[PDB]
Every structure is written in C-alpha cells, then in structure tokens.
Design a protein around this ligand. Sequence first.
Ligand SMILES: Nc1ncnc2c1ncn2[C@@H]1O[C@H](COP(=O)(O)OP(=O)(O)O)[C@@H](O)[C@H]1O
Ligand SMILES: Nc1ncnc2c1ncn2[C@@H]1O[C@H](COP(=O)(O)OP(=O)(O)O)[C@@H](O)[C@H]1O
Ligand SMILES: OC[C@H]1O[C@](O)(CO)[C@@H](O)[C@@H]1O
Ligand SMILES: OC[C@H]1O[C@](O)(CO)[C@@H](O)[C@@H]1O
Ligand SMILES: [Zn+2]
Ligand SMILES: [Zn+2]
Lengths: 294, 294
Amino acid sequence: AMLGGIEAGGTKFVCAVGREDGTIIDRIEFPTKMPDETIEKVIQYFSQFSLQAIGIGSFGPVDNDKTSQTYGTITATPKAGWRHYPFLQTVKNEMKIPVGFSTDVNAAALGEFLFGEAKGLDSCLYITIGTGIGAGAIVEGRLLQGLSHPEMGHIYIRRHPDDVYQGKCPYHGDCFEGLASGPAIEARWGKKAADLSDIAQVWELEGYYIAQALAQYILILAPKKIILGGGVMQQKQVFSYIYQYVPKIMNSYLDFSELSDDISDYIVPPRLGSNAGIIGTLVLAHQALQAEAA
Amino acid sequence: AMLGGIEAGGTKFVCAVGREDGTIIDRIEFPTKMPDETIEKVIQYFSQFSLQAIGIGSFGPVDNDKTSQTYGTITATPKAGWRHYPFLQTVKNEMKIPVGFSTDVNAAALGEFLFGEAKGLDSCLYITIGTGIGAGAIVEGRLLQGLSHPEMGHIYIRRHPDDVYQGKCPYHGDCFEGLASGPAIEARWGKKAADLSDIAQVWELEGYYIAQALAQYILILAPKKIILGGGVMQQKQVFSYIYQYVPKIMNSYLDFSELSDDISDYIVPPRLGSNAGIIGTLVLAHQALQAEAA
Ligand SMILES: Nc1ncnc2c1ncn2[C@@H]1O[C@H](COP(=O)(O)OP(=O)(O)O)[C@@H](O)[C@H]1O
Ligand SMILES: Nc1ncnc2c1ncn2[C@@H]1O[C@H](COP(=O)(O)OP(=O)(O)O)[C@@H](O)[C@H]1O
Ligand SMILES: OC[C@H]1O[C@](O)(CO)[C@@H](O)[C@@H]1O
Ligand SMILES: OC[C@H]1O[C@](O)(CO)[C@@H](O)[C@@H]1O
Ligand SMILES: [Zn+2]
Ligand SMILES: [Zn+2]
C-alpha cells in the first residue's frame, strides 16, 4: 500500500515514498531547475517503487480548482519555466496513477491535522515562514479553497515605527512576507538569519510582525490551533515574543484561554518538525486514491 | 409552516414572522432596553402567531459554540444588562419550540446565500458597515465558526497618512471599525454620515479603508462573492472607490476576473437590501426546526 509525495519548492524538490499513516519509507531531494528535467528526475526516482498514488504540494500561487482547465499548474512565479507548466498533468501522464495536488502549506496543514498538533480538532492553520510566507487552513476537516487557495503571506500588516526597511516583496513591497520572510530579515539586517541568532532586536521585530499577522487570522478565521513552521521559526525565541504581542494587539476583545493564559498551547511549532509538508503530500496521495475508488 | 426571527441590535430589535422561502409575513420593531423587558416585548409579539421555530441573529461577540455552557449569550458588550444574559435560553423556555442562534451578520450571510447575490455559490462573505463593522462567512455551504465566530471588523488596517483621527473603537482605537464605522465617520468629520453625502473626500477615505480590509479578507478567505450592507453603504458612491482601490492594493498578485475587470460583480450590495439579516433569521429558524426533526 505505498504512496508517493513531491514537495515542490523553489530551491529544491523533495520526493518521498511512504504509507497513509504518515511513515516515510524513503526520500530523495534535488535542486529545482527547469521543469522538464526536474520532473524527469521525479519520475526516475518513483520508477523504483510500486506506487498506488502520488500527492504534489507545490509552491504557488497555483490553480487548485479541480474544475479549471489550468488545474494543477503554478499560475504565478518569477522562476524560469514554471508558470503554466502542466505539472499535475505531466505527472499523471507518466505515472498513470491518481495524483492529488495542493499548495505546499496546505500539505503541511494536512500533515499536522492528521498526525500532529491538530490531530483530534476540526480546524487548524499552518503557517510557514521561510523564503516566503504562506498558510493553509482546515475548516470543518477540509482544506480551505475559495476563489483561490489563500495567500495569507501578502496581507499588509502595520509597520513598526522604528523599521525603515522598504520590504522584499516584488508585488507589494511591505506586505507581511515582504517584512518578515527569511530574505527580508537578511536584506534588512545585512547578515543571514541563522547568524542573527543573538541579536534580540531582530527577533522582537520578527515576532511583532508575526503577532500582527496572527491577530488578523484569528479575527478572520479563528482557527482552533495555529502551527508555525519554516526556516525562520527554527529561532524558537520568536515564539516568546509572539506570545507577548498577540494579547496586547487583541486587547482582550475575544475571551478565550487560547488567546491569553494558554496561548503557548495555541500557537505552537509543528509536531512533525520539518516534515509536515512531505508527510502531508502522502495524505494528498491517499485522498486522490480514495477519490478514484469512489 | 410559520417561522419567527429576531434581529437583536444594540439600538433596536426587529422581530418578524415569515416562511422558509424568505417571505416576510409581518414585522415589528422596538428600542433595545434592558433584556427582561426587551425579551418580554418579543414574546408578546410572537404570542399572536403559531410558530414552529425561531431564529436569533444577535449583535456580538456571542458564544456560538453549541457545546458551550454559555451558548446563546452575548459575551461582551458595554450595553447595560446584555452581557451574559441567557438570551437563547429565555426564548427557548418561553416559546417551547426550537430556536436557532447566530450573529446578526451570519444571519445576513445566510439570507444572501439562499436568496440573494450568493444564491448558487458555495461561499460568500457578508460585511455590514454601520454602528459597528462585522462580517459573516459561508464556506462550503456552512457558516464559518472556529474557536469563535469571526470578528472581522477589528482587524488593524493601515491608516491613511492624511487622516489624523485616533479611532472610535474602545478596545483597539484605530482598527477597521474604529476608522470606518458610521460613528467613526461622524466623530472624524463633525457631522452625521447621511449629511456628508456631497463631500467626496469622506467617501474616498471610507472606500480606501474598506478596500484595505477587503484585500485582507480576499487573501485569507478568498470568498466567491462579497456583499456589503449597513447604513454607511447606503452611500452607493463608496462602491466606486472600493472598485478602484482593491486592485491597486492587490497589485495583480491573484489573477481572477473577480478581482479586476468584473470586480463590480464580485463586491456588491445585498439583493435583499436592508432585510438580509431578518430574512436570514428565518433561515436560522428553519435550520433549528430541521435539526429537531433529525
Ligand atoms: N536555522 C535557521 N534559523 C533562521 N533562519 C533560517 C534557518 N535555516 C534557514 N533559515 C532562513 O529561512 C529561509 C529558508 O526557508 P525554508 O522554510 O528553510 O525553505 P524554503 O522557504 O526555501 O523552502 C532563508 O531566508 C534562510 O536564511
Ligand atoms: N442613509 C445613510 N447614509 C450614510 N450613513 C447612514 C445612513 N443611515 C444611517 N447611517 C449611519 O450608519 C450608522 C448606522 O448603521 P446601521 O446598519 O444603519 O444600524 P446599526 O449598526 O445601529 O444596527 C450610523 O452611524 C449612521 O450615521
Ligand atoms: O512556499 C511559501 C509560500 O510562498 C508562496 O509561494 C507565495 O508567497 C505561497 O504560494 C507559498 O505557500
Ligand atoms: O453588528 C455589527 C458588528 O458589530 C459587533 O457587535 C462588534 O463590532 C459584531 O459582533 C457585529 O457583527
Ligand atoms: Zn506581497
Ligand atoms: Zn476594534
């Protein structure tokens, strides 16, 4: 009963083989290059296994409307060749088994929903903070997909009055991702994020920005758990600042222990560590396989 | 097959009797006073009719978790007597028929979802802009209820650099409601909203603020239709400014015609005019009645 997953990133692809309970049997990774040659490496890796289904969690924006002619393509990216490349369809054509598709952060959300911190709940929100910011939400046990999947990393939070950085996002400048991604932390401070470890000021600022973003998500979706992952969130100090700032921002407007005394159990790192997304792509495989039996 | 509705407002109650197709048979309104005497007027009006069920759409925050001990109470308000008053339970006890409960804007959303601009869709967002700002969302045909219902009117949008008004909201100051409610427009400009009709500047500012709020809701929920109601939105000029500003804010990040060329059919006034909420309380009645048959 083996399943394949592809977590398509802008810098790397991670492919894996595993089971529906989330165990990883095997995995490989390789640099993201042009699509033809990148997917060819994908196919070459899976050809060794007898797989029943595959799931793709891709960086987006993507067309995640099953009824759309461009379903399963990346709809916007500056990365050469990926926009409008028939990603889902080329994998379906070559492997000839069901293939599920979603964003990478939707994949992480399913992982943490079935096997991680949101197991037993019916709602959660997974936010990744790395090269980009993105988030995926589960409402009533099902991924949130409206007109588009969400693009929660491009909301315009309020600047800090002492921050003079113009922002990294090429569309918005100083949206959340623009102010608070890993690359925004570097462009702002002049060194790599992992190396700013001991400059408290960087992490108060980062936490202030995440906190503002979370206030909005709480007011708008009100998820029953918020899981924060990605490279930047390896600085576990950021959590303590978020815990201090969310309540100050909300200012007691919504009386839930999740938002005050027990906030440290509401906004948490992922139980699956950095594997939420790849594990979640096994879930997307499994769903695709069940939809074909249906 | 007659149903009752109560739209509980901070200034007035509107009660009505009607049918599940949304027709209003009769209605009454009266000032919101203390609860005992206000609910007593409610009971006195319904005693004339043979009703099968009732629905309450209340101003909130409210406890809208069916499994909660304080289910069907208003959990926060400065209005004398209403906090923690057993509103739902006192109506259930006196009428002895099923009673549905939700926010007032959730009620409006159901109205427009079954009978208005979102009929045939599976998702929508209803926003009221009046004494307060609030919103209710339908995802996959079902009201969005997480940890709390949403309180979308208290998000911290960005100020306009020329606006020096400190904000009306007693919790946040210059959150969205704080900047853009009817009373914020008056406290800011020194006259009543209906009388600022011809000062274009008031409505550019109002539209700029709504537009910022909508950008966030689109990025976070991505609803398939956005309906704007309430007293302030009787100045239909505000729509033209929103249509100009949403696309500038999003800056082509999400390529959907709803967000650009066809934006005038995406963000719209309610088809049910100012009766979305009361009509929606008939829907909540009908749902409560079906849950009892189940
Ligand atoms: N241990 C770390 N601590 C802080 N920042 C890190 C760490 N590792 C990577 N980063 C930063 O996070 C970003 C990478 O995000 P990540 O989730 O690791 O991958 P990607 O977003 O490229 O798929 C980079 O800008 C990098 O500087
Ligand atoms: N025709 C109108 N044009 C502009 N503003 C209005 C109009 N009617 C009422 N208002 C304003 O909208 C607010 C009232 O909101 P509304 O939805 O009518 O009721 P409430 O929020 O009290 O239930 C007030 O601050 C008032 O000044
Ligand atoms: O991968 C992190 C996030 O960055 C984006 O590509 C755009 O900001 C999102 O689609 C994604 O979920
Ligand atoms: O009634 C308009 C809106 O104002 C509030 O009472 C708080 O801002 C919300 O609960 C409501 O939906
Ligand atoms: Zn952006
Ligand atoms: Zn507020």
